Swiss-Prot record, chain A:
Recorded phenotype for the gene knockout or disruption: Lack of photosynthesis.
Free-text description of this protein's post-translational modifications in UniProt: Binds 4 heme groups per subunit. After the signal sequence is removed, the N-terminal cysteine is modified to form a diacylglyceride thioether, but the alpha-amino group is free and is not N-palmitoylated.
Gene3D superfamilies (UniProt xref): Photosynthetic Reaction Center, subunit C, domain 2
PROSITE patterns per record: MULTIHEME_CYTC (PS51008), PROKAR_LIPOPROTEIN (PS51257)
Official protein name in the record: Photosynthetic reaction center cytochrome c subunit
Keywords: Electron transport, Heme, Iron, Lipoprotein, Membrane, Metal-binding, Photosynthesis, Reaction center, Signal, Transport
Topology versus the membrane: Lipid-anchor
GO molecular function, one term: heme binding
SUPFAM superfamilies in alphabetical order: Multiheme cytochromes
Organism of provenance: Blastochloris viridis
Swiss-Prot record, chain B:
Family matches, as InterPro entries: Bac_photo_RC_H_C, Photo_RC_H, Photo_RC_H_N, Photo_RC_H_N_sf, PRC-brl_dom, PRC_barrel-like_sf
CC annotations in GO: plasma membrane light-harvesting complex; plasma membrane-derived chromatophore membrane
Membership in a protein family: Belongs to the reaction center PuhA family.
Gene for this chain: puhA
Cofactor: binding comment: Binds 4 bacteriochlorophylls per trimer. Binds 2 bacteriopheophytins per trimer.
Name of this protein: Reaction center protein H chain
Organism of origin: Blastochloris viridis (Rhodopseudomonas viridis)
From Swiss-Prot, chain C:
Cytoplasmic-side segments: 1-31, 111-114, 198-224
Protein name: Reaction center protein L chain
Residues binding (7R,8Z)-bacteriochlorophyll b: 153, 173
Residues involved in a ubiquinone binding: 216
One cellular component (GO) term of this entry: plasma membrane-derived chromatophore membrane
Membrane topology: Multi-pass membrane protein
Residues binding Fe cation, per UniProt: 190, 230
Family the entry assigns: Belongs to the reaction center PufL/M/PsbA/D family.
Principal localisation: membrane
Underlying gene: pufL
UniProtKB/Swiss-Prot annotation, chain D:
Cited function: The reaction center is a membrane-bound complex that mediates the initial photochemical event in the electron transfer process of photosynthesis.
Disulfide-bond pairs as recorded: none
Binding site for Fe cation: 217, 232, 264
Name of the molecule in the record: Reaction center protein M chain
Compartments (UniProt record): Cellular chromatophore membrane
Gene this protein is translated from: pufM
Cytoplasmic side: 1-50, 137-141, 223-258
GO molecular function: bacteriochlorophyll binding; electron transporter, transferring electrons within the cyclic electron transport pathway of photosynthesis activity; metal ion binding
Family: Belongs to the reaction center PufL/M/PsbA/D family.
Subunit record text: Reaction center is composed of four bacteriochlorophylls, two bacteriopheophytins, two ubiquinones, one iron, and three highly hydrophobic polypeptide chains (designated L, M, and H).
Residues bound to (7R,8Z)-bacteriochlorophyll b: 180, 200
Residues the entry annotates as binding a ubiquinone: 250
Species in which this protein is naturally found: Blastochloris viridis
Listed transmembrane segments: 51-75, 110-136, 142-165, 197-222, 259-283
Amino acid sequence: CFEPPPATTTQTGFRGLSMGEVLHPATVKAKKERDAQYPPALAAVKAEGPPVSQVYKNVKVLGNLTEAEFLRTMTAITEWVSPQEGCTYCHDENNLASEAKYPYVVARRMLEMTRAINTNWTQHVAQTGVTCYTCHRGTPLPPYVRYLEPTLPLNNRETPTHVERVETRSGYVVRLAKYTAYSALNYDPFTMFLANDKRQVRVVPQTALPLVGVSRGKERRPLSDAYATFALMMSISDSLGTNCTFCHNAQTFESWGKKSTPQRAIAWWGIRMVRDLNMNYLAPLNASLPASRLGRQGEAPQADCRTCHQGVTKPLFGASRLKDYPELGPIK
Amino acid sequence: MYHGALAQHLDIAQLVWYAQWLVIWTVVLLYLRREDRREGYPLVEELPYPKTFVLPHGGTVTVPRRRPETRELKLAQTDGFEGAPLQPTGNPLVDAVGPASYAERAEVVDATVDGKAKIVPLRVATDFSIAEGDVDPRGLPVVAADGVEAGTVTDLWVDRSEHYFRYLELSVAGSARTALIPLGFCDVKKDKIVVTSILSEQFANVPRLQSRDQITLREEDKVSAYYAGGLLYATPERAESLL
Amino acid sequence: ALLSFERKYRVRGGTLIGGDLFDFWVGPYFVGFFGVSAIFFIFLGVSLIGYAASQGPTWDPFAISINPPDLKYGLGAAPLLEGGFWQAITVCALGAFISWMLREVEISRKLGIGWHVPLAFCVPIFMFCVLQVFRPLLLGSWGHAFPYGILSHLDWVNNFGYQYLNWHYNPGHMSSVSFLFVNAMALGLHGGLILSVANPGDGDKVKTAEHENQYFRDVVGYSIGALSIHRLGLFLASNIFLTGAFGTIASGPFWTRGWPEWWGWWLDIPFWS
Amino acid sequence: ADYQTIYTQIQARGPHITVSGEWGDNDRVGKPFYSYWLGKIGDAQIGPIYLGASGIAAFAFGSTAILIILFNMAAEVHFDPLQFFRQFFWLGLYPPKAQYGMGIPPLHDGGWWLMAGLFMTLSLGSWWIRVYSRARALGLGTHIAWNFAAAIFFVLCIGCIHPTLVGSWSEGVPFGIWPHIDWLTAFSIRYGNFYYCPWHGFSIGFAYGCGLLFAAHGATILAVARFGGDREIEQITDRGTAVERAALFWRWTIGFNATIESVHRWGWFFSLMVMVSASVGILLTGTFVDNWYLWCVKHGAAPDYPAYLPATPDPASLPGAPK
Ligand code: BCL
Ligand code: BCL
Ligand code: BCL
Ligand SMILES: C/C=C1/c2cc3[nH]c4c(c3C)C(=O)[C@H](C(=O)OC)c4c3nc(cc4[nH]c(cc(n2)[C@@H]1C)c(C(C)=O)c4C)[C@@H](C)[C@@H]3CCC(=O)OC/C=C(\C)CCC[C@H](C)CCC[C@H](C)CCCC(C)C
Ligand SMILES: CC(C)=CCC/C(C)=C/CC/C(C)=C/CC/C(C)=C/CC/C(C)=C/CC/C(C)=C/CC/C(C)=C/CC1=C(C)C(=O)c2ccccc2C1=O
Ligand code: HEC
Ligand code: HEC
Ligand code: HEC
Ligand SMILES: CC(C)=CCC/C(C)=C/C=C\C(C)=C\C=C\C(C)=C\C=C/C=C(C)/C=C/C=C(\C)CC/C=C(\C)CCCC(C)C
Ligand SMILES: [Fe+2]
């Protein structure tokens, strides 16, 4: 029911505004240990030789590497994605140029997606970046994925209870609640805000008086938009393991400048990145993944904030493998 | 265009802000603060026009009161300073000064809604009784502040309008009289009524009633005030500093 | 200068400390040892606010703010303009609060009444201590306290509540809020009742204590009583901060998540999960 | 110490009193019974209670609203008795989520909400007749009735008046423990932080002010209960030393005082102003003010603070930023 003292507290705003983080050491310790499982970088290899675009038969993304450099990435990918199944999770053992297994054709699109994040979304991932492990955590199914409807538990490696199963209709409210930090907000902020770019997260006016033509009757947005924004902000806050004073001065949520922290702007690029990953890379994968991977509406698993963060403001507390695998980005 | 915008840089929510302050201070200073002045005014040593109540049992009253008689205070000033304290010239409990002071209430019996005497002993209110489980104080000794038995409880006086005991009546030991005491000045135990406001000998000068089975509004004031004056005057130490 | 019924009460005595030394009146105000110490801390406090405010960027009453130190200074001393001024004014505020309360005890004793009012005044002084001393001590820094400013301290209350996602779900908050509502409701009921009996309208007779209990037995089936509504009203009012003190001191020292999630002790019981 | 201020040491019993009203004496129902433990901190007699047409209409209209709410809640858990008892704090009846303006919304999206609120409005109005007529029947002033009306008015402000003034049933308060709580944050976010509504501060000062007043007044009457201060009606018409010492306590502390009558006018006025201030604030909200914080910024009242972490430009404003 209660968590013992002492607590870790930081300051994110001017003194006397009560802005900053409030952390529990025992929680942070468990996440630091869990995130320390990141396999260290593989050792450097010979830089001279032909490019695998010559050596091999069906290399389409990593063609400029040498053979030694290319088999290195093939080992790190296995360590990050399918370490227990080994090479044959994606490869016909008797012909490594065959695309006969569905994880092969998905892995190539993931190789392109990973380079895309590190090259086109540095406004967010910066120089830390992401590798296969950032999401997969050593399993082919990433632990924290979303479907077009709320699902429990949040960690798909955990066995669900009966009421937690998406088929049991009497537990819908709890499936909605736990994805919005236990609130009673009646909105699914993933499909609404993170699956695509259709809706507007901002709901507060930037004028002191009601502007004529958007302030009466059906000119108005419904107040349901304010709840939904609040729902996305409870899900954002929980998936990063933080509170809003990490980003807003609650004096004026809608105001930037001195009223917002530099992390709020990074968060803004994080929303534009999730939509790009969901719309252009992850959702079209339902034509390549087997029916046992799809959701009840034929959707492939998709990503939110928690896919990479898993309860920390920075994925893996900032651990990086960018300099060790340049073939993952940024791409010249 | 904006809803609520007016001339200049003015808006409607701005105007109501001035109106709200004007109404609040108008009610506070011009009404509530004048209703506060219906008693104790005018000062001695802005007022509202009189208010008249029609009493439930005949007659009227108009506040504040102008009594046909006023009492002579047995008090001596301690210094000529305008805000200097006064000092008793005799026995403050019987002279009724300071915490022993009573007000000049009407010498009438407080009445029930149907006209009967409101505060009466149980010997008159034979339809009343003490609730089952509570101590019946009749027949228990009254122990005063000095630890001496001041007397013995003879009856309880009940408020027939509210069903609430308000006094105990006790025979004063060695004085051939009975005095009333407000139950607030009584610590009711199973075998004794403890009273720390006054000493045993000071029970002899409790103000006496004109009638044995009724009490007036001023007699109730006189009886209550005598024990309260003992909080400060029962012993010389109670008027001094605690530390 | 004096009320028409005041002179017979203007006697000496009832003091806690000082004796006759400070036992006098200044106009209508009684003084006593604690009236002197009250003016001491108020003058000292108002001075410190004045000198600090002159150092600031504004004399606008809504914009002036005197804030505590940064979190990094902890519970130690802080530079005068970087949190020190706040430290001294806080000490002066407590001195004026406690002196005002003990002064009320002395006035109570001279009047021969109970000490109910100064005892009740300890409730808001205690809650002030929970915000500015007790919770900062548990959290480790004075910078966790609220600033002294008309509009700035609202921003403290705002960010504090949002630091825990949705402060409304704080269970100590729900109790403090429930008492705030019922007390303001009961004061309108009770104040309206007494005025309805004494002002029946037109030229009708003033009603009785029997009419009081009959009204509320008719409306709701129960009437608590004339004296009992005053014990109740003081109980309801006091429990605004008494129960609220729990939710404030638990936020941080005993709970670092959002308050909605605290309710998982119920929602996450395995036999209906 | 006055032990009577803590509890009733000796409780009295007697024949139960019945004061006749102009009408409805025959509509009082119930045999009174006496609780010993309730008698220690109040009157021991519970009941009887008056019925009447308005009190009956209140139960019928009100039970209708509550029945509509609970049924819709039971459907949210698909009529599972375990989950309903589990998730009860989270279930609710919501106003229309889509924007239909003032058109009566569908039953599955706000229609049941609007209908329960109608029956609740009829239930509140019926109860006010009871509160008002019972005072007239007993020859009492309507001081409680008009305080009650200000609370009913504020409920109408957040219930249907403001939704009508802005023209949307979506702005109304949902029914439910947590859901009606969640409305408070969405209604403050939407309109620019209610901490910057001056009527908000006015309603807060009076609400705090009722706490200060009943603490000071309640304690004052307890302190003068030794002199029958609780007998306040007769202390008004015939001043006793109880309210003389009470006025002089406050006169010697704060330099002024009230009367035993007028202190009730303060308390009745402060409670009334909690609702009057809150009503004017909701009526101005959305109709003539869209953002209370920027409204205070427009008039120069908002406080500003130095940057602690560096200022953060709006990235949507940057050149080449996505929509
Ligand atoms: C987003 C922000 C949050 C929020 C954040 C907080 C926080 C944070 C706190 C509260 C607390 C409180 N909140 Mg809030 N609260 C919210 C929503 C609400 C709502 C609502 C309708 O939604 C209500 C009714 C309330 C109401 C309440 C109060 C009942 C409660 C106690 C106030 C307090 O401690 O005062 C304190 C008052 C004092 C200390 C006054 C002391 C006075 C002294 C003794 C004398 C002063 C003399 C003066 C200087 C003299 C001048 C001289 C002149 C001559 C007069 N909150 C929202 C959701 N709320 C507190 C609490 O208890 O929470 C459990 C608390 O800590
Ligand atoms: C945890 C909860 C928060 C809190 C949350 C809020 C919120 C939210 C609101 C207020 C509001 C107010 N609060 Mg605050 N408030 C808290 C604690 C305090 C303390 C203190 C000693 O800790 C003080 C002095 C105040 C004082 C005040 C007033 C500025 C204002 C009206 C209150 C009122 O009517 O009270 C009841 C008392 C009376 C009716 C009697 C008269 C009291 C007068 C008005 C006091 C003036 C104080 C003024 C600042 C001068 C101080 C001394 C100078 C040195 C001369 N609050 C705590 C820290 N308070 C409201 C407002 O409008 O703020 C601008 C508001 O919206
Ligand atoms: C994030 C959330 C927001 C917030 C959102 C709002 C909103 C939105 C509103 C308020 C309002 C109020 N808030 Mg605020 N509030 C916050 C922070 C605070 C703080 C603080 C210390 O921080 C305080 C002291 C307060 C306190 C207050 C109140 C003084 C004020 C009036 C409401 C009230 O008393 O309702 C209590 C009284 C009632 C609800 C009346 C009920 C009367 C009826 C008759 C009862 C009927 C009972 C009957 C049995 C029902 C039967 C039902 C069946 C279904 C039939 N809030 C923050 C900033 N608050 C209001 C206001 O003043 O707005 C300008 C308002 O509309
Ligand atoms: C739960 C019970 C409660 C309750 C009860 C009771 N309330 C009482 C009593 C009882 C019983 C009294 O007997 C006593 C009194 O006689 O009343 C007339 C008193 C009084 N309640 C006051 C204010 C009050 N009560 C609040 C809270 C509750 N009260 C709750 C509701 C609030 C809120 C909510 O904000 C306020 C503002 C004063 C008017 C008065 C003390 C004067 C004083 O002590 O003077 C002595 C001190 C001074 C004159 C000023 C000292 C200035 C310092 C040194 C420098 C400034 C510091 C300051 C922190 C800066 C603040 C900035 C600001 C923006 C943050
Ligand atoms: C000049 C100088 C330095 C002198 C030194 C001596 C000295 C100590 C002086 C004190 C100087 C100071 C600091 C004065 C400030 C005093 C203060 C804090 C004044 C604030 C006044 C305020 C805002 C009070 C808020 C509460 C309020 C609205 C009260 C109005 C209604 C009243 C008066 C309620 C009090 C009151 C109550 C509560 C009763 O129950 C009661 C019962 C029967 C009769 C009368 C009363 C009564 O008057
Ligand atoms: C999770 C994905 C994954 C894992 C694990 C994996 N493969 Fe790969 N493999 C691929 C993909 C996708 C390609 C195509 C890459 C491209 O087109 O550039 C590929 C290409 C290759 C090729 C190029 C052959 C050709 O002619 O196209 C070789 C050789 C290879 N992998 C070897 C390995 C080795 C060695 C391992 C483990 C030790 C391994 N693979 C495990 C997905 C995987
Ligand atoms: C890690 C980042 C982050 C966290 C945590 C966060 N916010 Fe946000 N919030 C944002 C960003 C970025 C936006 C702007 C969205 C956009 O531009 O599309 C925003 C928008 C908002 C808005 C609407 C702004 C407008 O103009 O309408 C509100 C209100 C809000 N947040 C409140 C909250 C609340 C409440 C919480 C937690 C309880 C919270 N925020 C936590 C980053 C965050
Ligand atoms: C696919 C990858 C990915 C996703 C999805 C993602 N993050 Fe990030 N995010 C990162 C990485 C990597 C960093 C580390 C950047 C750094 O070290 O500064 C980061 C950093 C941040 C930071 C900066 C924290 C700090 O201390 O500076 C914030 C805030 C943030 N993310 C919020 C979000 C938001 C908001 C979302 C989604 C709406 C999100 N994250 C989802 C990869 C991701
Ligand atoms: C068992 C006992 C004794 C009691 C049971 C109580 C109970 C369990 C109830 C069930 C669930 C609970 C606790 C629900 C709580 C709901 C709460 C807190 C609601 C709070 C606020 C809701 C409000 C203010 C709703 C207001 C709505 C209105 C005023 C609507 C007004 C409508 C109109 C004017 C209609 C006119 C328009 C016409 C054209 C249709
Ligand atoms: Fe009263």
